[PDB]
Every structure is written in C-alpha cells, then in structure tokens.
Amino acid sequence: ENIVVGPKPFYPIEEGSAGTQLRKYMERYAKLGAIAFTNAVTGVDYSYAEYLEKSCCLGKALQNYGLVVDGRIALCSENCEEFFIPVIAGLFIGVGVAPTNEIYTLRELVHSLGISKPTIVFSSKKGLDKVITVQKTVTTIKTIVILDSKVDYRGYQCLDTFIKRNTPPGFQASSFKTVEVDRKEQVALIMNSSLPKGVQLTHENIVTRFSHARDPIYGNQVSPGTAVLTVVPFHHGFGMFTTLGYLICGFRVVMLTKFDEETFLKTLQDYKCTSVILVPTLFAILNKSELLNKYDLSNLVEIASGGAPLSKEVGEAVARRFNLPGVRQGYGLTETTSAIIITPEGDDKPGASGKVVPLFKAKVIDLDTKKSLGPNRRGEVCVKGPMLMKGYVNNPEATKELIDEEGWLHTGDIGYYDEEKHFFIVDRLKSLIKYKGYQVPPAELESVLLQHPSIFDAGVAGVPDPVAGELPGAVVVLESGKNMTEKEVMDYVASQVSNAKRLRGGVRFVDEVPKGLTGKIDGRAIREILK
Numbered sequence: 001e002n003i004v005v006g007p008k009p010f011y012p013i014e015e016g017s018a019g020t021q022l023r024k025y026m027e028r029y030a031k032l033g034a035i036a037f038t039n040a041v042t043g044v045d046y047s048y049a050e051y052l053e054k055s056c057c058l059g060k061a062l063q064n065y066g067l068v069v070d071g072r073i074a075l076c077s078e079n080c081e082e083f084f085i086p087v088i089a090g091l092f093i094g095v096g097v098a099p100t101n102e103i104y105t106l107r108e109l110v111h112s113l114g115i116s117k118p119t120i121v122f123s124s125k126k127g128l129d130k131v132i133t134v135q136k137t138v139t140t141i142k143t144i145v146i147l148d149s150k151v152d153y154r155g156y157q158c159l160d161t162f163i164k165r166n167t168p169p170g171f172q173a174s175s176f177k178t179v180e181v182d183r184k185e186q187v188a189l190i191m192n193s194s195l196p197k198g199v200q201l202t203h204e205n206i207v208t209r210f211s212h213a214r215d216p217i218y219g220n221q222v223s224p225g226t227a228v229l230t231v232v233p234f235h236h237g238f239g240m241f242t243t244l245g246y247l248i249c250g251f252r253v254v255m256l257t258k259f260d261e262e263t264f265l266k267t268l269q270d271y272k273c274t275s276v277i278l279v280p281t282l283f284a285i286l287n288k289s290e291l292l293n294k295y296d297l298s299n300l301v302e303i304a305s306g307g308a309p310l311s312k313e314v315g316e317a318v319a320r321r322f323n324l325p326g327v328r329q330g331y332g333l334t335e336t337t338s339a340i341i342i343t344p345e346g347d348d349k350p351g352a353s354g355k356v357v358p359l360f361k362a363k364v365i366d367l368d369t370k371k372s373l374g375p376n377r378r379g380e381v382c383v384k385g386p387m388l389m390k391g392y393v394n395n396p397e398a399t400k401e402l403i404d405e406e407g408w409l410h411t412g413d414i415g416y417y418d419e420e421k422h423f424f425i426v427d428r429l430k431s432l433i434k435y436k437g438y439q440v441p442p443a444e445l446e447s448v449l450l451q452h453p454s455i456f457d458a459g460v461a462g463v464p465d466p467v468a469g470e471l472p473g474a475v476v477v478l479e480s481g482k483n484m485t486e487k488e489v490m491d492y493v494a495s496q497v498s499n500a501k502r503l504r505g506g507v508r509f510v511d512e513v514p515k516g517l518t519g520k521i522d523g524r525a526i527r528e529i530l531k
C-alpha cells in the first residue's frame with residue numbers, strides 16, 4: 001500500500017549460528033595481529049587472538065561446569081574491555097546471555113535477573129555488592145565470577161580462575177568447536193530496554209545484524225585495524241549490536257567509560273579514530289567546546305548518533321565544527337534487535353534518522369484510524385522484518401500488544417517519511433503533551449532550549465492543568481557561571497515557537513536533567529520536579 005520496503009542486502013545472510021559466524025571473522029583478525037578492544041583511559045589492549053582464545057576457553061569451561069544448550073548466564077557490569085568474553089562464549093555454546101549494567105538500582109536488578117534466571121553471574125568489581133544482594137532474593141544464582149580482575153577478589157573466582165578450575169590442564173583453545181543451533185528458535189540474548197521486561201533475541205536476529213554491519217551503504221566497510229570510539233553502554237542493544245558488528249568488521253574498539261571533554265578529544269587524536277558513536281546528550285558538550293582546535297582530529301570521518309531524539313540544529317552545527325557532511329543516525333528499539341532505520345552512506349539529510357534497512361518494511365499509521373499514511377504525515381511507526389524479537393520472557397500478553405495480528409511491531413514512536421523515503425523520528429507517543437487539542441512533542445521544545453548559549457541541557461514534560469489538560473514545562477541546566485531567570489527562558493522560547501508550544505507550565509533549574517542511559521528523558525521524574 002503505503003509500505004516502505006528496504007533493499008536487498010549487499011552481503012547475504014551467511015550460514016551458521018551467531019557464534020559460528022563470529023569465530024569465522026575473529027579467527028581472521030587474530031592471525032593478522034589486530035587489536036579488538038582498547039580501554040582509552042588505561043590504554044590496555046586486547047588483541048583479537050587473546051579475545052578469541054579467552055572466549056573459546058570460557059565456552060569449554062561453561063560446558064564442563066554443566067551448562068547445556070538453552071542454559072542462562074548473566075553479566076552485571078559497567079563498560080569494561082572484558083565485557084564481551086561471556087557474551088561471545090555464550091553465543092559459541094548456545095547458552096542465553098542476559099546483560100545488565102552496574103548502574104541499575106537494586107530493584108531493577110532483582111527484577112531483571114528474576115526474569116532471566118541465570119545460573120552464573122559475571123560481575124565487575126564495582127557491581128559485586130549489588131549482585132551479592134540480588135543473590136539473597138534470586139536464589140537460583142549458583143556462582144558469581146569477577147570479570148575485570150586478574151586475581152581472585154574478596155573470595156570470588158576471577159575469570160581466569162574459573163577457566164582454570166573448569167578446564168583440563170592439557171586443553172588447547174584450538175580444539176574447541178561451536179555448537180550449531182536452531183537459528184530462528186534459539187534465544188541468544190535477553191535484553192532490557194532503557195520494571196524491565198526480558199526481550200528475547202535469537203541467533204537469526206543477530207546474524208541479520210551482521211549482514212547490516214558490513215553493508216557498504218547501511219553499515220561500515222570491512223577495514224581491520226581501523227579505530228572506532230564508543231561511549232555507548234554495552235549491556236543495552238545500542239552498545240551490544242554496534243560492538244558485535246565492529247568485531248565482524250575487524251575494527252579496533254576504543255572504549256571510553258566515563259566521559260570527559262579533554263579525555264574524549266585526546267582519545268580521538270591518540271588513537272586516530274575514524275569514527276565515533278555517541279548518545280545525543282554529548283553533542284551539547286561538543287557544540288560548546290573551546291578545545292576542538294588544540295587537537296588533531298583530521299582522521300575522524302564519521303560521527304554517529306542514536307538512542308534518543310537529536311536536535312537537527314545541534315547535529316548540523318556539530319557536523320560543521322568537525323568538517324563533516326552530516327551526522328550518521330540509527331533508529332531502533334530493543335525489540336527490533338538493533339537499528340532498522342539507518343543513514344545511508346553519502347545520503348545524509350539534516351534531522352533524518354535515515355532509511356529502512358535491508359530486509360525490513362516500515363509504515364506510518366494514523367493515530368485515530370489505524371490507516372497507512374503517505375509522505376509528510378505524522379503517525380505511529382510500525383516495522384516488520386527478521387530482527388523482530390521472539391517475544392518477552394513469560395509475558396505473552398505484552399508480546400501480543402506490541403506485535404499485531406499481521407506481524408507488524410508497533411514502536412510507540414511518532415514519525416514521518418518524506419517524498420524521498422527518508423524517515424524522521426519525532427518523539428515517543430506516550431510523551432506528547434496534550435495541550436487542549438494539540439499534541440506537542442517535548443523533543444521539539446528541547447531543541448529550541450538547546451540552541452541557547454546559556455543552556456547546557458534541558459528536558460520537557462507536561463504538567464497537569466484543569467483548564468488545558470496539560471501544559472509544557474521544562475527543567476533546565478545552565479552552563480557553569482551563566483545565569484538566567486524562569487521568565488528569561490520563557491520569553492526566549494515564546495519568541496521562537498508558535499503559541500501552543502509556549503512553556504506555560506513553568507521552568508525549573510536543576511543540576512541534572514533526569515535521563516535514561518541511552519539519552520531518553522524521564523518524563524515522570526520531570527513532572528514531579530515541576531509539580
């Protein structure tokens with residue numbers, strides 16, 4: 001009808017499980033002498049050969065430990081260079097992996113691990129306290145392994161100890177064989193979005209991502225040794241599936257845990273990074289930065305973003321500062337594995353999230369009538385393709401509400417496409433501010449607020465009102481030293497937008513705009529601050 005269809009992929013989906021394909025590629029970069037992971041802050045490298053060997057050795061160890069196909073393990077860790085060893089090993093042996101982050105509240109962690117039910121938890125040092133407390137409630141956790149220590153830590157086996165205690169002394173990594181699985185049925189990963197539900201992704205979902213990752217238009221060209229800088233969380237699909245695609249491509253993954261303006265720029269220079277992937281929050285910092293010029297950034301050819309709405313004006317300004325044509329955006333959901341809309345190489349358009357990825361379909365549906373829309377009409381984005389999740393763990397009800405009777409997943413996101421089939425993502429449906437008969441997107445007002453020289457960060461939500469239903473209000477973080485009044489912010493917004501978008505609900509100044517880990521505004525937190 002009004003359906004938008006993505007092209008055929010350059011590279012067909014290869015045969016084999018997610019683990020078989022990963023080993024195939026990693027083996028190649030291993031012989032080359034390539035480095036897989038670099039911690040930018042400590043300067044610690046892991047070559048592809050060491051990473052491959054530790055993943056194979058861990059795979060054997062887990063089998064010897066007694067884990068069968070369709071068993072479960074989890075991670076609870078902030079970004080560290082060892083993060084993917086349990087992930088890759090799990091994929092090699094057909095055991096489901098549930099990534100969580102150290103930054104979870106205990107309530108989130110008890111609920112998340114309560115759903116996935118892991119036999120072993122690979123924890124970082126910093127996460128150990130929280131994982132010990134989770135174990136008192138989620139009592140099916142037998143073992144905790146410390147991921148980022150070379151020696152045992154507080155009485156818990158470190159990763160090397162567990163491999164050593166669970167492989168024979170004569171075992172060579174090279175004698176290990178990956179397990180073939182039923183691809184469309186085998187759960188590979190249990191993901192949480194940014195109380196969490198368990199999103200089940202299969203080996204088929206993942207091997208499709210691998211095809212996109214190496215696509216010359218929708219991914220990155222294979223080029224071993226090329227350094228990429230990432231600041232995105234690894235436990236989330238944003239970080240999970242960009243990173244796995246980088247390993248397929250042979251890239252050197254430069255990881256930066258805590259963001260810092262000077263460290264960020266030093267890193268880009270010192271590793272001659274070709275590309276950088278960011279959450280939208282960080283653009284605000286780069287647009288204001290006075291330091292850009294004191295660094296050699298001549299090698300940077302691509303700046304990528306995702307996770308949350310990106311101000312088209314801030315994005316353009318940042319592209320201009322780094323002398324690039326545009327920003328490469330990706331858009332997707334945890335439920336669709338990874339990005340299903342991606343900026344095509346050499347087809348940038350300011351404010352667009354990109355175009356439908358190979359093997360996917362997209363449509364925009366009217367909010368009222370559920371009917372398909374032509375270009376330039378806003379509505380709910382729906383998508384269909386082989387990266388749709390298997391379902392939520394033990395939640396058939398929520399699964400049915402998301403994927404309709406015709407196999408279309410309803411994103412809960414509002415957007416539109418233009419005459420050229422470029423997709424623009426506006427905001428989340430649940431976030432629209434219902435001011436009288438208007439539906440006002442907070443992202444549109446956030447953008448205006450971000451263009452202000454005195455405003456570092458902003459967030460917008462609706463405030464209840466007996467007359468109008470909802471009034472747009474904002475929380476605003478000023479640049480250090482700078483100073484503004486509630487009315488100054490309101491007057492500046494009023495001069496730029498139409499009547500309906502005015503900040504009738506007030507402005508409050510805060511230290512930190514409440515946000516999720518991938519950049520999405522916590523509208524509930526802002527409502528409360530404002531009221």
Ligand SMILES: Nc1ncnc2c1ncn2[C@@H]1O[C@H](COP(=O)(O)O)[C@@H](O)[C@H]1O
Nearest residue numbers: 193194307308309330331332333334425
């Ligand atoms: N490029 C993007 N532009 C606007 N919103 C995005 C973009 N990418 C992801 N999102 C938002 O993040 C959501 C998926 O994140 P998550 O719930 O953590 O799986 C999407 O439904 C969108 O609301």
